[PDB]
Amino acid sequence: KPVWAPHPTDGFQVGNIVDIGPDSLTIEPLNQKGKTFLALINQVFPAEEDSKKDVEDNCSLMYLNEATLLHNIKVRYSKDRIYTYVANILIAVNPYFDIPKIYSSETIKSYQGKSLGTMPPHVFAIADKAFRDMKVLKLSQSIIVSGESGAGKTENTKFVLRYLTESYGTGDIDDRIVEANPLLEAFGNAKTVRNNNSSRFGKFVEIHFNEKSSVVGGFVSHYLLEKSRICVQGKEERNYHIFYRLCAGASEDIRERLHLSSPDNFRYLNRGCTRYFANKETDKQILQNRKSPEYLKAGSLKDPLLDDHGDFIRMCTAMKKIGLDDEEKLDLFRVVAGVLHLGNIDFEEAGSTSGGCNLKNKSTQALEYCAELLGLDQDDLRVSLTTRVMLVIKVPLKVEQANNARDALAKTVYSHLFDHVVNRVNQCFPFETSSYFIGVLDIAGFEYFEHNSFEQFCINYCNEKLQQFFNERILKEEQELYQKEGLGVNEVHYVDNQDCIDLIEARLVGILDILDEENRLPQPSDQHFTSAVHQKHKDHFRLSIPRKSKLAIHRNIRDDEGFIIRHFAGAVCYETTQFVEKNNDALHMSLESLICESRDKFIRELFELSFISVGNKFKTQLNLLLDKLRSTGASFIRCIKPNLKMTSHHFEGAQILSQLQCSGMVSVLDLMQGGFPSRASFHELYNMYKKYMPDKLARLDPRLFCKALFKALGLNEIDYKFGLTKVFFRPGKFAEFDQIMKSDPDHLAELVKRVNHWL
Ligand SMILES: Nc1ncnc2c1ncn2[C@@H]1O[C@H](COP(=O)(O)OP(=O)(O)O)[C@@H](O)[C@H]1O
Ligand code: VO4
Ligand SMILES: [Mg+2]
Incomplete structure (x- = not known):
């Protein structure tokens, strides 16, 4: 029977074990009767028998391992299904083109009120599940969209906001929450080499609701706009979109009044790429006098989404709409x-x-x-x-x-x-009071380039804290609940990243404080700052000197000219020049x-010495955010960037596998295979049906009424498990678990009625 074995660019390849030896296996790759190759035994995995099938929840796989997870997501991607679950967590692989209709109003309505599992995996189902939990648990909710730069966090954040406003909105406040985003993208998004529409700030978008779960307004928090881009960019990057939307799309009256001209005429744009995003037709709508010589020679930049001329029009519409x-x-x-x-x-x-x-x-x-x-x-x-x-x-x-x-x-x-x-x-969209919110989090994602400075450090630090919160809520607390409730779930170990966060944020000797101390010295030196970092963190597993990099371009960076942080998502070599002056926010x-x-x-x-620490301001803002996140129920969408080229239909297995590993999803799949994503207390269940119980049922202890209700509802007992205080449901049973939680009096009486009959 065919198995999965390592492959340097595909991640795994399929073959047959043809011999076995001391500490290795001999593999014959499918349809290569000649060749064999050796693999360590712990690197070979069983494979699903049907290689063209996929499952909607990775928990349903026959064999649950990193290789089967990779392959299942691939088969789905190859069929333009970019969404897949691991129980109640969503995996989203960037398609890099618009798949027709999957975000239409029609698809929106088809998801409304549906339980996880009863519709295909979709971002819409994650949003609906948050609205329902909000209503039923009386508890503000947060949807955390994670991933590296270009994975698709922002697009998905917009799908969630659109779903929620269209489905649970008033029926003009909606639109306004949705139109806000393109407006903020104009001022805070920019072309980087990883993403044509890179967010250069983090956002938390809160939709607020009253007691009857109706939208009363919204609130957008923003975190650390990238400053240096305002003034200078690398040759393949741009400044914020607004500069080019304006130059491309402004009327002649506006260009005259503001003395604009083609982007090559401004220092703050011309070290960067001075070309517009445009297609054959939109190019013709931009006046000749807006075009740079670079644009005239090389032609427009192509993108499926961005169009500077068309985006200026849309941004003005959006301004008028709000x-x-x-x-x-x-x-x-x-x-x-x-x-x-x-x-x-x-x-x-x-x-x-x-x-x-x-x-x-x-x-x-x-x-x-x-x-x-x-x-x-x-x-x-x-x-x-x-x-x-x-x-x-x-x-x-x-x-x-x-x-x-x-x-x-x-x-x-x-x-x-x-x-x-x-x-x-x-x-x-203001409001004076509210009962709960659904907040969606969209940060600037993990990124690195040939040269990494303070901007990449702050951004990757923020990704680090987010990944830690995922670890806390999903890998740590979940296992702590299974144990506390006596479920005997086999413990799953994982590499935690709190040590990386400590290196950065610990008092007095954290990088952020060492940098602050440097800003306050008489002769602030990037070199002095960096030496102190290396010195106070000798043998720290998350820190190294630049010359230990795997990339040759870093080999000539002196010890006191940078450091490598071993982030959860990978090593990044930072050059420390300008850290000190970039850390001062004071004008x-x-x-x-x-x-x-x-x-x-x-x-x-x-x-409405002067020194304001950018680093510690940011830390303080993120800790407050985290406190807010901890006070909510949290859902997670893990976005995956399929390749380094922004193309559709190019699944890079090794690149994708690497992200599945680093995101903790291989560990989650392992815990979940034998875990219980749904639960509620015996007592609250009993107390909710009580007033409808005839005396024969009311007399049962809470635990035994539940057993009766579940047995009457056709529920199989492989499918649930009674803990000390809660009953727990396995993956794939969200529909059955939701029917049990339904608090609608007609529904409660109907299920009680079914219990009576069953007795
Ligand atoms: N679901 C999707 N459908 C179509 N295009 C997408 C989708 N997700 C991402 N993209 C494309 O990928 C680009 C980068 O996505 P974005 O959300 O900006 O990434 P991130 O915010 O994670 O860095 C988008 O501008 C868009 O072209
Ligand atoms: O390219 V991103 O929107 O993760 O900053
Ligand atoms: Mg974004």
Whole structure:
């Protein structure tokens, strides 16, 4: 009988064991009567007998191992079924094209009120299950969407919000919650090499409900907008979409008023890719004077979803749908164009004269446009960017320092604009009180590149905490409940990642605190910071020096120029240059005073050793989020990126297997095969049917009424198990378990009626 054996790029391959030896197996790959190869015994797995079949729940497999899990998800993917369960946890493999109709209004309605198992695996079923648990358990809910960059977290987050608003919404508040997202994507999403539409901030979106489970409003929390991208990008990346939507789609009147032109004309865009997303037809809708030479030569960027011209139109519709007037819209655009012009203010050395620098003569217009759009005096701005009062005098800044002042001001203005946008979105659906919420979490996903800096460190830190919460809720607490209730479920061990979080966040000697301490030294040094990190974490399993990397490009990074963190999702080598200055969130007073005293009302509203730790601010925000998550029932969607090329129909087995392992899903499948995802207490069950019980039943102890109710309901006893205080149901029995929990008086009387008859 055929088995699964290792394969370097497919993960596993199918063959037959043809001989066995001391500590190995000899495998003959299917249809290769010649060749054999050797495999360790613990690396060969039994395979499903039918290789073309799939099951909707991986718990239903004959053999439950990492190789069968991989293959089952693959067979489904090959048939455009991107969703599969492991009990009540959803696995979602990015298709990288739009599969027709699977998100239609019709499909939405078909999922309404259905139990897990009675419809195909779908994100819609996860959302419905959260709404039902909310209602029945009287308990706010959270849906955690996880995965690496480009796995599909954001698309799925939008499917959940759409499902919930369409299904349980009022029937104009809905739409508003949905249209908020494309609006925030404009300001906080950008092309990176992993994702054409990468989220460069984390979000938690809360749909709030009253006592009768009707939507009363929403609330969007936002976490750590990436700042450095505002000013510079790698050549295959872009700044936030809004810059290119505006350049591509603005009317000529708007382009004139804001002095826009093709993206190559702005420093804050032109180190990056200056090409638009467009297809053959949308290209023709963009005026020639918006196109860069790079665009004219190389043509447009292709994407199934993004279209800068078409996305500008949609973003303006979305603004009008949530209630921004044309004045608010133009204000947003003006500040955006002001940031652009700000970045064109360039500096040349003037050491022999002032000892500092002057503006380059060519930057004259930029200074003018910037000052006009930001309502500042040209001279005030000139002076704030080229000089600074210090300790007493007023000293001329060097060229490098003026650049930093220019960029720090640009980062803060744009950051405050983004903050204003998110707040404006919460204003479009406020509420004074609510009973529960369903929150959906969508973070920036695990990412690494040839060069990794502070941005990737913060982002991967946030993925680390999330994975830990999954471990806590699913692998730890679940096993603690089985034990506490005496179920004798075989313990499953796993590698935990709390040590990685400690390395980062522990008091005084965590990376975040060591970095903070560096910012407060007289001579802050990235090198000094990094040495201290290595020194205080000797032999720590999650830390290494860069030269131990598996990649050659890292071989020449000195010990004090970076470190490797061994994240749950994999080793990442960070280069520490700029960590110190990137960790400071504080804007110097001169620049703050400059922008707070703008002539423009709107800009004033943006703003209502100086050092504010970005790292510890972020930590504090995430711990509060986690406290909120712990106070809820949690559902999990694990997104999987099938390949490194953004193509459809290219399942990379080894890449996918690696993510199934790192996400803990192989461990979960192991625990679940003999676990009990559904349960409720004997007493609460009894107490709920009590008032409908004739005396013959009421007299039974709670436990024995349950046995009667289950036996009357045709329920087989392989399918459940009585613990100390709770009864537990196995995977595949969600429908049967939901019928038992149904609290509808007609339903309760009907089941009691069935028990009476059964006696
Ligand atoms: N279910 C899906 N259907 C169609 N396209 C998808 C789906 N999920 C992801 N994609 C594509 O993959 C890209 C990346 O998805 P996204 O949700 O932005 O990833 P993440 O947020 O996890 O980094 C999307 O912009 C879209 O093109
Ligand atoms: O590419 V992502 O939206 O995980 O940041
Ligand atoms: Mg996203």
